C-alpha cells in the first residue's frame, strides 16, 4: 500500500543547495550574481524565460567540493528526474525573486491590476504558476568538458530516436535529427480562473493534464457563506495562458540501421521556445523525456503501455557579430578573397577554377530588386552545367549543396515535377487536399541541385520554368488556389545528348534544351573533357594525393573552412551595392555588341542562341555579386568586364576546341 522506499536524495537539501547556487553563483571565471541579474531582469519583466545551465551547476559543484561540501551533485541529479527539479528551481527562483527595478511592465497587466485588488478584497491562496511569468529552462551539459567522463556515459551525446530507451523516461536527453513536421502554435492554460457573481470570488483551477473537466460549482466561501450554489464562469483574461506547439523529429538516414524504417518522436514545446524550430532542418534538441498519459477509456484500453513524448529544454542548430567581424577582416586583409574562396571551393576537385568562381558568384546571389512602380526582378542566379559524363559535375553539386546552409540536393528521375515544386496530398486527414512544399519550397532562400537535368521530364522542366524566372509558385490545383513566394537559387547538371558533346553537332543541338529554358539560366557552362597528357598527369597526381592523403595536396594554396565561407558569404550578401552610370554605358554597349553578334551569328557552328534582355539582367546580377564579394558599395566596371569574361569563357570553351 504505497510502501515507502528510501532513496539517496533529500529535496530539502537539494533545494537549499539550489538557492545557495542561484544567489551565490556568478560567471566570475568567464568575467551581482548572473542568476540574480537574470532574476532582476525578470523583475523588470525584461525576460520571461530562464535558462539554468547544467554546466554552471557543475562549476558551482566543483567550487563547493574544492571548498569542501556535502555536495548533492545537483548537475547529475537533474538528469535522473528533471521535471520535479524544474519545479524546485522555479520555487527557489520565486523565493529568491528580487523586487522590481526601474519601471515595472505592469502598466495594464490584468493580473497585477486585479491580483492586488483580489487581495484587498481578501484583506497558497492562488497557484504560484498564475503569478509566475518566467519560463524556466535548462541548457544541456557542454560535451567539450565531459568532466563527468565515467559519469558522462553519453549524456550530451545526441541519440537517434531508436537510440532512445524507456529507461531514459523522466530524464533529460539529447537527440539529433530532422524536424519532419511542425504544428501551428496554439494556446494552453496553466491555470484556469472561474468567476461567479454570487461569491464575487475568482477561484483558480490549475490544470496539468492534457484535458480537464470544468468545476461548474463554487467551493468559494462567499457562496458557501450565504449557502448559495455558485454558477462559475470561465474568465480567459483571468485564466493563465501559454503558447504551445508540437514538432516531430525523425531519424537521420545515417542514424537509421540498414533495412530499418526511420523512427520519429513527437516533441512538445511551450513558452518562449515555441516556433524556434523549423521543419525539415537538422537540429540537436535537449529536453525532458516523459510519458504521455491517456484519456480514461483509451487508458483502460492501453493499460500499462504508455505513449511518450519530449519536452525540449533547449535547441541547437547545426547551422543558421563582432567576433564574426574580426574573423572576416582577417580574410579581407589576407586579400584576393574572391580567388582564394573559389579555390577553397571543392578542394577535392582539381582545376575548373573558373567554374568554382562562377559557383561562388551564384552562392552570394545577385541583388533582389523591387521598383516603385511595383516591378520586382529576380536577383537569384541560375547556372547550368552541360558536359561530358564523369567530369565531377555531380560531385561539385553535392559539395555546393553541403556548403550552402539551406542547400538541397535532388535528381531529376528521383524527383517528380509536382514533388519538386509542390504536391497536393488528397488525404492527409479527412480526405482534404493539402498543398505540400516541394523540393524548391525546401530550397527557399537556398540552392537546389538538380542532376541529370537533361534526363528530367520536359513537362516538369516547363514546370520549373515558372519558379526559376519568377520566384513565386502559383498553384490552382483542385481545392487549392494559392501562391508561394518560393525564392531560391537553381543549379542544374546535365550532359550533351548522346551522353557527350559532338563537335559536328551545333552547341544548341548538343544542349538540346528549350530556348526559353536556356535563356532563363543566367549562365550555361560547356565544360568538356579532352585527353591532355600533361593535364591528365596533373589531375591524376592531385587525385592520387587525395587518395593517399585525405587532405588535397596543398599545392601552395590555403583553403578557408566551411563555417568561415558561410559566415563571409552572409556578410557579403548583406551589402546590396548600387551601380554607376559609366558602368551603364559600358554594359549597354556590350549588350548591343552581343545582340549584333547573335543577329549575325546564327551559324550552327557558332550559334549559342539569340541574346535576350534576361542575358543583360544576368550580367547585371553577376556584376552585383562580384561587388558583393569585393564588398564595394557600388558595382565597378571591373566587375562588369569580369562577368563578360566569365560568359565569354563559358562560350569559348567549345570554340577553343
Amino acid at each position: 500500500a504505497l510502501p515507502s522506499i528510501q532513496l539517496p536524495v533529500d529535496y530539502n537539501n537539494l533545494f537549499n543547495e539550489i538557492t545557495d547556487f542561484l544567489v551565490t553563483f556568478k560567471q566570475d571565471t568567464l568575467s551581482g550574481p548572473k542568476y540574480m541579474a537574470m532574476l532582476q531582469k525578470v523583475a523588470n519583466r525584461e525576460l520571461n524565460s530562464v535558462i539554468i545551465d547544467l554546466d554552471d551547476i557543475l562549476q558551482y559543484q566543483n567550487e563547493k567540493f574544492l571548498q569542501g561540501t556535502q555536495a548533492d551533485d545537483l548537475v547529475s541529479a537533474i538528469q535522473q528526474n528533471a521535471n520535479h527539479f524544474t519545479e524546485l528551481f522555479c520555487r527557489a527562483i520565486d523565493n529568491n525573486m528580487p523586487l522590481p527595478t526601474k519601471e515595472i511592465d505592469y502598466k495594464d497587466d490584468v493580473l497585477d491590476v486585479i491580483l492586488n485588488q483580489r487581495r484587498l478584497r481578501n484583506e497558497e491562496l492562488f497557484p504560484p504558476n498564475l503569478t509566475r511569468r518566467y519560463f524556466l529552462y535548462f541548457k544541456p551539459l557542454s560535451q567539450n568538458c565531459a568532466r563527468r567522463y565515467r559519469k558522462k556515459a553519453i549524456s550530451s551525446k545526441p541519440l537517434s530516436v531508436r537510440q532512445i530507451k524507456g529507461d531514459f523516461l523522466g530524464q533529460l536527453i539529447t537527440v539529433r535529427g530532422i524536424i519532419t513536421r511542425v504544428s501551428d502554435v496554439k494556446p494552453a492554460v496553466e491555470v484556469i480562473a472561474y468567476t461567479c457573481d454570487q461569491c464575487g470570488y475568482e477561484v483558480f483551477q490549475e490544470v496539468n493534464s492534457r484535458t480537464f473537466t470544468p468545476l461548474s460549482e463554487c467551493t468559494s466561501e462567499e457562496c458557501s457563506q450565504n449557502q448559495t450554489k455558485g454558477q462559475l464562469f470561465m474568465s480567459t483574461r483571468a485564466s493563465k495562458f501559454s503558447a504551445f506547439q508540437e514538432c516531430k523529429i525523425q531519424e537521420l538516414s545515417q542514424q537509421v540501421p540498414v533495412g530499418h524504417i526511420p523512427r520519429s518522436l513527437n516533441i512538445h514545446v511551450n513558452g518562449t521556445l515555441v516556433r524556434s524550430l523549423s521543419p525539415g532542418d537538422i537540429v540537436d534538441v535537449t529536453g525532458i523525456f516523459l510519458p504521455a498519459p491517456y484519456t480514461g477509456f483509451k487508458a483502460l484500453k492501453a493499460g500499462l503501455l504508455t505513449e511518450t513524448y519530449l519536452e525540449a529544454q533547449f535547441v541547437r542548430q547545426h547551422k543558421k557579430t563582432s567576433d564574426v567581424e574580426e574573423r572576416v577582416m582577417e580574410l579581407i586583409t589576407s586579400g584576393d578573397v574572391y580567388n582564394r574562396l573559389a579555390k577553397s571551393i571543392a578542394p577535392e576537385i582539381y582545376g575548373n577554377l573558373d567554374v568554382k568562381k562562377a559557383l561562388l558568384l551564384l552562392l552570394v546571389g545577385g541583388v533582389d530588386k523591387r521598383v516603385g512602380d511595383g516591378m520586382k526582378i529576380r536577383g537569384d542566379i541560375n547556372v547550368c552545367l552541360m558536359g561530358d559524363p564523369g567530369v565531377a559535375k555531380s560531385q561539385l553539386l553535392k559539395a555546393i549543396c553541403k556548403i550552402s546552409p539551406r542547400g538541397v540536393y535532388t535528381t531529376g528521375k528521383g524527383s517528380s515535377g509536382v514533388g519538386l515544386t509542390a504536391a497536393v496530398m488528397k488525404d492527409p486527414v479527412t480526405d482534404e487536399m493539402i498543398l505540400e512544399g516541394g523540393a524548391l519550397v525546401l530550397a527557399d532562400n537556398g540552392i537546389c541541385c538538380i542532376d541529370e537535368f537533361d534526363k528530367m521530364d520536359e513537362s516538369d522542366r516547363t514546370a520549373i520554368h515558372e519558379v526559376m524566372e519568377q520566384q513565386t509558385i502559383s498553384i490552382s490545383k483542385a481545392g487549392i488556389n494559392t501562391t508561394l513566394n518560393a525564392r531560391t537559387s537553381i543549379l542544374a547538371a546535365a550532359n550533351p545528348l548522346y551522353g557527350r558533346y559532338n563537335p559536328r553537332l551545333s552547341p544548341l543541338d548538343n544542349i538540346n534544351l528549350p530556348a526559353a529554358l536556356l535563356s532563363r539560366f543566367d549562365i550555361l557552362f560547356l565544360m568538356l573533357d579532352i585527353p591532355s597528357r600533361d593535364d591528365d598527369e596533373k589531375l591524376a597526381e592531385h587525385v592520387t594525393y587525395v587518395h593517399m592523403h585525405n587532405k588535397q595536396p596543398d599545392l601552395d594554396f590555403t583553403p578557408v573552412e566551411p563555417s568561415k565561407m558561410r559566415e563571409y558569404i552572409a556578410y557579403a550578401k548583406t551589402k546590396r551595392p548600387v551601380m554607376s552610370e559609366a558602368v551603364n554605358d559600358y554594359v549597354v554597349q556590350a549588350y548591343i555588341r552581343l545582340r549584333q553578334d547573335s543577329k549575325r551569328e546564327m551559324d550552327s557552328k557558332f550559334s549559342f542562341g539569340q541574346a535576350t534582355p534576361r542575358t543583360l539582367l544576368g550580367i547585371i546580377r553577376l556584376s552585383q555579386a562580384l561587388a558583393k564579394l569585393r564588398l564595394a558599395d557600388m558595382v565597378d566596371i571591373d566587375d562588369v568586364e569580369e562577368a563578360l569574361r566569365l560568359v565569354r569563357v563559358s562560350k569559348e570553351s567549345l570554340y577553343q576546341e
Binding site: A146, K157, G259, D388, G419, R500, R533, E541
Partner: protein, 619 residues
C-alpha cells in the same frame, strides 16, 4: 509460497552445481561495471541462458516442472538467479535510480526441447501454460514502446517516496490481480504525491507475428502464425522477414466469450507466447576461429593466392578466369574514402559482361549471388526503376525501398541489364555514382544510402557481339552509363575445336559429379580453398585490412591512366577520370586480397593488367 521458496533454493543449488552460470553472471557484472568506469563518450542485460539439459540432469523434477509448469517454476528460478547475482554482486554506490531500478536477472534456455519444440501450425491448445519453442518467419513487427511497471512517487510535505508496481498479463507469467494503472495521486495519509519519473521504472514492450515457414506451409492452406510479446532486451532483436526459432511460455488471455458482456460467446480465448529467448536462424554472417585466422594468415603467405582464390570461384564455369579475378576483387571491394569536408569517394567495384546467349554469364551471376554474403538478384525486365531504387508508398505516405536500398553495404546483380528500361537505367545512374538514393516525389523529399555494389549482365545489341561493329554499336547502353560503370567484360563465343572439347569435357565431368554419400541411381537428398573458407577469408580481410596507397603504386597508376586516356587506340569505352578511380579501387582490392595495410606497386600493376585486358582487349 513454501513451494516457491523451496524452488528458489533448489535453483540456487542448481546454480551452485554449474559455476559456469555464476562465472558468466560475474562476467556480466564486471563488464557493465568497467563500462561505467571511464566512459569517455553498451551494458550487458541481466539475462542468462541456462542449459536445459543441465537442469534435466541436476534435478529432473525441477526440469520437468519448468518445461510443463513454467508459470510455477520459472518465477522462483529467476528470483533465485537475481538473488545470487545481487548477493554476489558488489552493487557499489548505486545511483538513486539504480537503487529504485531493482533491475532483475532474466533466464533463458538452449536446445533439447523435445516435444515442447513445435511450429506455429503444429501448436495446440494443450501446450498452453507450458514452456515451448517454435520456428518461423517474423512478420508485422510492431514498434517499440515503453510500459509502466513501477510508479515511484515522492510524498511532498513528508519527505518520502511511495512507489507502486503494476501487473499485466505479459509482464508476469502467473495471473495476478490487475493493477488499476493509475498514478498514485495522493498519499494514503492524504499528502499529495508527485510522479517521480526516471525513478519510476519502465520496460520496453514489443509485439511481433511469427508465421509458419512457407516451406512447411501445407498446400491450399494459409500458414498459421502466432504472436510473441518481446520485452526488454528481447525487443529489437529481429525484424520482418526473419526466419527464427523462439522460446516462450505459450499462454492464454482474455475472456474468449466467457465474459457476461459477451452475447454470442462463440469466440475463443486469446493466446500468446511470452518469448523468453530468441534464436535467430540465418538458414548471414560467417564465423571465424583463431585457428581459421591463422590459416588465413598463412594462406596470404602464398604468393599467387589471388589466382588460387579466383580459380576457386565459379569452379563449375570455365574460361572466364579474368572475370573470376574481377569478381574476386569486387567481392573484396576496396576502400571507400569520405573527405572530412563531406565528399564521398566510391571504393566499390562494379562488374558487367556483354555475352552471347547461354554464355553462363547469368550462371556466373548466380554463383556470385549465392557465394556473396549479402546480395541482390534481379533482371532487366523483372526490375523497376522505383522497384530498383525506391518507390513512394502510400503506407502516412512512406517510401518503399528498392533493390539498391536493400543490401546497401552488400552486393547487387542484374540479369539482362541491356533489356532494362532506359528510364530505370538513368534512375540507376545516380544510385551507383553518388552511392546514394534521393527521392522527392509525392511531396516526400528523402535521401538514402545506396553504396551497394552492382554486377549486371547483358547481351549485345545484336544478340551476338559483332567484333567488326563498334562496341557502341554492340552496346545499347550510353557511354555515360558505361563510363559511369566500372569494368566492361565483352565475352564472345568462339568455335575453337580444342576449346570446344575442353568445355565439353568440363561440363561432362561436372554432370558426372558424385555426392560422396550417394551412389549411382541414388537421387540427391590446382589447390582450391573451400567456398565457406573462401567467404571466411573475404570477411576477415574486409574486417581487418585497409590498404594504403604507395607513391610507387601511385606513379604506376598515374602513368597507366594518363597513357590509356592519351592512347589514341580505340577502346571498348571512353577513358575518363572514372577510369582513374577504377584503377585506384582495383589496386586497393588487390592489396586487400594480399591482406596488407599498405598497397604495393605489384597490386597496381595487376590492376592495370586486368584493366587493359578488358578496356583495350586481351593483354
Amino acid at each position: 509460497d513454501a513451494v516457491f521458496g523451496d524452488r528458489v533454493r533448489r535453483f540456487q543449488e542448481f546454480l551452485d552445481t554449474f559455476t559456469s552460470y555464476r562465472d558468466s553472471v560475474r562476467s556480466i557484472q564486471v563488464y557493465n561495471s568497467n563500462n561505467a568506469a571511464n566512459y569517455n563518450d553498451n551494458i550487458l542485460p541481466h539475462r542468462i541462458i541456462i542449459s536445459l539439459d543441465d537442469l534435466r540432469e541436476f534435478d529432473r523434477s525441477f526440469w520437468s516442472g519448468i518445461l510443463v509448469e513454467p508459470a510455477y517454476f520459472i518465477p522462483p528460478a529467476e528470483k533465485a538467479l537475481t538473488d545470487l547475482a545481487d548477493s554476489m554482486d558488489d552493487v557499489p554506490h548505486p545511483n538513486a535510480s539504480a537503487v529504485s531500478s531493482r533491475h532483475p536477472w532474466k533466464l533463458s534456455f538452449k536446445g533439447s526441447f523435445g516435444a515442447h519444440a513445435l511450429s506455429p501450425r503444429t501448436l495446440t491448445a494443450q501446450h498452453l501454460n507450458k514452456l515451448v519453442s517454435v520456428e518461423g518467419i517474423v512478420t508485422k513487427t510492431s514498434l517499440v514502446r515503453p510500459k509502466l511497471i513501477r510508479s515511484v512517487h515522492y510524498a511532498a510535505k513528508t519527505g518520502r517516496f511511495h512507489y507502486r508496481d503494476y501487473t499485466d498479463a505479459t509482464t508476469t507469467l502467473t495471473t495476478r490481480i490487475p493493477t488499476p494503472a493509475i498514478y498514485p495521486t495522493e498519499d494514503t495519509e492524504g499528502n499529495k504525491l508527485t510522479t517521480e519519473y526516471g525513478y519510476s521504472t519502465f520496460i520496453d514492450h514489443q509485439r511481433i507475428t511469427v508465421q509458419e515457414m512457407p516451406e512447411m506451409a501445407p498446400a491450399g492452406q494459409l500458414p498459421r502464425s502466432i504472436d510473441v510479446i518481446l520485452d526488454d532486451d528481447l525487443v529489437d532483436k529481429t525484424k520482418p522477414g526473419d526466419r527464427v526459432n523462439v522460446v516462450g511460455v505459450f499462454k492464454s488471455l482474455g475472456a474468449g466469450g466467457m465474459n457476461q458482456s459477451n452475447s454470442n460467446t462463440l469466440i475463443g480465448f486469446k493466446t500468446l507466447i511470452l518469448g523468453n529467448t530468441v534464436y535467430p536462424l540465418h538458414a548471414a554472417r560467417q564465423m571465424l576461429t583463431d585457428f581459421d585466422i591463422r590459416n588465413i594468415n598463412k594462406l596470404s603467405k602464398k604468393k599467387d593466392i589471388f589466382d588460387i582464390l579466383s580459380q576457386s570461384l565459379a569452379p563449375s564455369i570455365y574460361g572466364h578466369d579474368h572475370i573470376k579475378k574481377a569478381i574476386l576483387l569486387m567481392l573484396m571491394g576496396g576502400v571507400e574514402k569520405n573527405l572530412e569536408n563531406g565528399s564521398h569517394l566510391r571504393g566499390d567495384i562494379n562488374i558487367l559482361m556483354v555475352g552471347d546467349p547461354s554464355t553462363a554469364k547469368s550462371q556466373l551471376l548466380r554463383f556470385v549471388l549465392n557465394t556473396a554474403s549479402l546480395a541482390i538478384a534481379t533482371t532487366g525486365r523483372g526490375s523497376s526503376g522505383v522497384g530498383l531504387t525506391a518507390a513512394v508508398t502510400t503506407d502516412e505516405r512512406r517510401l518503399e525501398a528498392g533493390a539498391m536500398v536493400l543490401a546497401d553495404r552488400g552486393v547487387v546483380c542484374i540479369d539482362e541489364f541491356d533489356k532494362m528500361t532506359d528510364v530505370d537505367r538513368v534512375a540507376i545512374h545516380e544510385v551507383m555514382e553518388q552511392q546514394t538514393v534521393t527521392i522527392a516525389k509525392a511531396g516526400i523529399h528523402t535521401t538514402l544510402n545506396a553504396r551497394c555494389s552492382v554486377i549486371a549482365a547483358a547481351n549485345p545489341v545484336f544478340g551476338q557481339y559483332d567484333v567488326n561493329r563498334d562496341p557502341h554499336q554492340n552496346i545499347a547502353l550510353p557511354d555515360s552509363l558505361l563510363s559511369r560503370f566500372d569494368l566492361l567484360f565483352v565475352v564472345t563465343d568462339d568455335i575453337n575445336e580444342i576449346r570446344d572439347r575442353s568445355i565439353s569435357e568440363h561440363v561432362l565431368r561436372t554432370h558426372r559429379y558424385l555426392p560422396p554419400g550417394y551412389l549411382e541411381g541414388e537421387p540427391v537428398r590446382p589447390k582450391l580453398v573451400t567456398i565457406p573458407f573462401l567467404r571466411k577469408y573475404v570477411q576477415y580481410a574486409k574486417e581487418r585490412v585497409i590498404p594504403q596507397l604507395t607513391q610507387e603504386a601511385i606513379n604506376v597508376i598515374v602513368k597507366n591512366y594518363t597513357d590509356l586516356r592519351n592512347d589514341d587506340n580505340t577502346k571498348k569505352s571512353p577513358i575518363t577520370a572514372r577510369t582513374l578511380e577504377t584503377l585506384i579501387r582495383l589496386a586497393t582490392a588487390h592489396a586487400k586480397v594480399r591482406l596488407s595495410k599498405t598497397v604495393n606497386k605489384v597490386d597496381a600493376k595487376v590492376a592495370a593488367n586486368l584493366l587493359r585486358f578488358a578496356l583495350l582487349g586481351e593483354d
